[PDB]
Amino acid sequence: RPTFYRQELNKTIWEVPERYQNLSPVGSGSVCAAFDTKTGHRVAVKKLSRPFQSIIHAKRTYRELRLLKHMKHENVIGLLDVFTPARSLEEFNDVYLVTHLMADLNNIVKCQKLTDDHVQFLIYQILRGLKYIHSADIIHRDLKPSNLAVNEDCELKILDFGLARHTDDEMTGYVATRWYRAPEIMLNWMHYNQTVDIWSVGCIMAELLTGRTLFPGTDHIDQLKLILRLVGTPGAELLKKISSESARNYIQSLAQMPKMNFANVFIGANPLAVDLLEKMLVLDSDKRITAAQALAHAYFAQYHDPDDEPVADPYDQSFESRDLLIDEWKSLTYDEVISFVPPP
Ligand SMILES: O=C(NO)OCc1ccccc1
Ligand SMILES: [Cl-]
Ligand SMILES: [Cl-]
Ligand SMILES: [Cl-]
Ligand SMILES: [Cl-]
Ligand SMILES: [Cl-]
Ligand SMILES: [Mg+2]
């Protein structure tokens, strides 16, 4: 067990191993930047807030730690360390997580002129990471520019997996928290699957090409109208698949519209980029291109290498259907903290 030291940073006590030095608050869990004397990296350290206050929160803590411990891919966040100052399960109350210190895609999109070559490389990396994530039967659920980290050499990592914690108020009005969401989950039409992430990638790619949000709706209904004007109103095949009669009823109240011509929307873009967007932004989720299929599209010809696009080890999510007490979720979490093995 390493030696820990204590300090108070913006009204929060931080108790961390000596290896982490020069802690500096970055945002409010709370996150601090630090220097890691063991690896020599600048790192981000996140202290979870009230990790075991309720059954829902305790299960959410376990979910985040299980996800981060599994991810071992160049284009996905990796866990450098996880620690607690507690010396036994009985005094266990705090969880700290450590990763490489990150700019996001929001900054470079608003501040830079991106060539088509930049768009190719950035979207290629998102899809390479998504192929890995989806191969473990994980759905991200919350892909958007602020959850994509980018460095000076245009290298990209996916982070901030959806933990099923975003509330209805967080998604209300003219907000980027909703602009990248698939239509079928924005209104809870259906039991969704991994195809919702491909819709988000299409929204991000459009924004890189034009510099503008694709579907900046002022509320849920305005956003649906913007979406259907581009991709067309649904046919009877897709309407069947909508379980709620209430949502089926509302859709049929709308005047029918055909799909627009994407070459006249995305004026001047690479024709291969337009073709890929048409295959991502399909209303019927069964018919969208998958991440593995998209990596083989001709738009990525200068980067695609099928011997260097790896898949993930299997990921057991049976805990998600399990009903446990707070102390039982807490003990499962403690076991995962103490068994952590750092990367090479
Ligand atoms: O991506 C996630 N959770 O899914 O957290 C990001 C993160 C992890 C560790 C330290 C700071 C920030
Ligand atoms: Cl130490
Ligand atoms: Cl503790
Ligand atoms: Cl964003
Ligand atoms: Cl009509
Ligand atoms: Cl597993
Ligand atoms: Mg985020």
Method: X-ray
Cα distances from 38 to residues 41, 42, 124, in angstroms, run: 8, 11, 32
Distance of CA 292 to the CA centre of its chain: 18
Cβ atoms of 220 and 187 within 8 Å: the answer is yes
- Segment holding 159, helix H or strand E: none
Residues 6 or more apart whose Cβ sits within 8 Å of residue 65: 82, 95, 97, 333, 336, 337
Q: Which two tokens stand for residue 14?
A: 């931080």
- CB count in 10 Å sphere of residue 271: 11
* Beta carbon of 214 within 6 Å of any ligand 1 atom: no
Cα distances from 179 to residues 108, 145, 218, in angstroms, run: 18, 11, 9
The reported resolution of this PDB entry, expressed in Å, is 1.7
Ligand nearest to the CA of 38: 2
Cα distances from 37 to residues 10, 21, 42, 43, 342, in angstroms, run: 24, 7, 9, 10, 15
CA pair distance 281, 275, nearest whole angstrom: 10
Cβ atoms of 55 and 44 within 8 Å: the answer is no
CA pair distance 144, 181, nearest whole angstrom: 9
Q: In ligand 1, which atom is closest to the CA atom of 159?
A: 1
In the reported structure, the alpha carbon of residue 233 is separated from the centroid of ligand 7 by a whole-number distance in angstroms of 32
* Beta carbon of 104 within 6 Å of any ligand 1 atom: no
Ligand 1, atom 4, residue with closest C-alpha: 160
The sign of the torsion formed by the CA atoms of 205, 209, 210, 212 equals: positive
Cβ atoms of 337 and 69 within 8 Å: the answer is no
Helix/strand/coil percentages in the chain, nearest 5: 40, 15, 45
CA pair distance 128, 295, nearest whole angstrom: 7
CATH 1.10.10.60 is held by the domain 105-300 = no
Category of 44 on φ-ψ map: left (φ > 0), alpha (ψ -120 to 50) or beta: beta
In the reported structure, the alpha carbon of residue 83 is separated from the centroid of ligand 3 by a whole-number distance in angstroms of 9
* Beta carbon of 79 within 6 Å of any ligand 1 atom: no
**DSSP 3-state of 27:** strand
Half-sphere exposure of 64 toward its Cβ, with a 13 Å CA cutoff?
24
> Rounded to a whole number, what is the largest CA-CA distance in the chain?
67
User: What are the CB-based long-range contacts (under 8 Å, 24+) for 48-57?
Assistant: 48/94, 48/95, 48/96, 48/97, 51/93, 51/94, 51/95, 51/333, 52/93, 52/326, 52/329, 52/330, 52/333, 54/326, 55/324, 55/325, 55/326, 55/329
Among candidate residues 195, 62, 188, 103, the one with its CA nearest the CA of residue 141: 195
* Beta carbon of 46 within 6 Å of any ligand 1 atom: yes
Among candidate residues 131, 150, 226, the one with its CA nearest the CA of residue 186: 226
Catalytic residue among 116, 160, 222, 275: 160
Among candidate residues 144, 231, 148, the one with its CA nearest the CA of residue 179: 144
Each residue of 1-31: b (16+ CB within 10 Å) or e? eeeeeeeeeeeeebebbebbeeeeeeeeebe
160 catalytic per annotation: yes
Q: Which two tokens stand for residue 323?
A: 């009903």
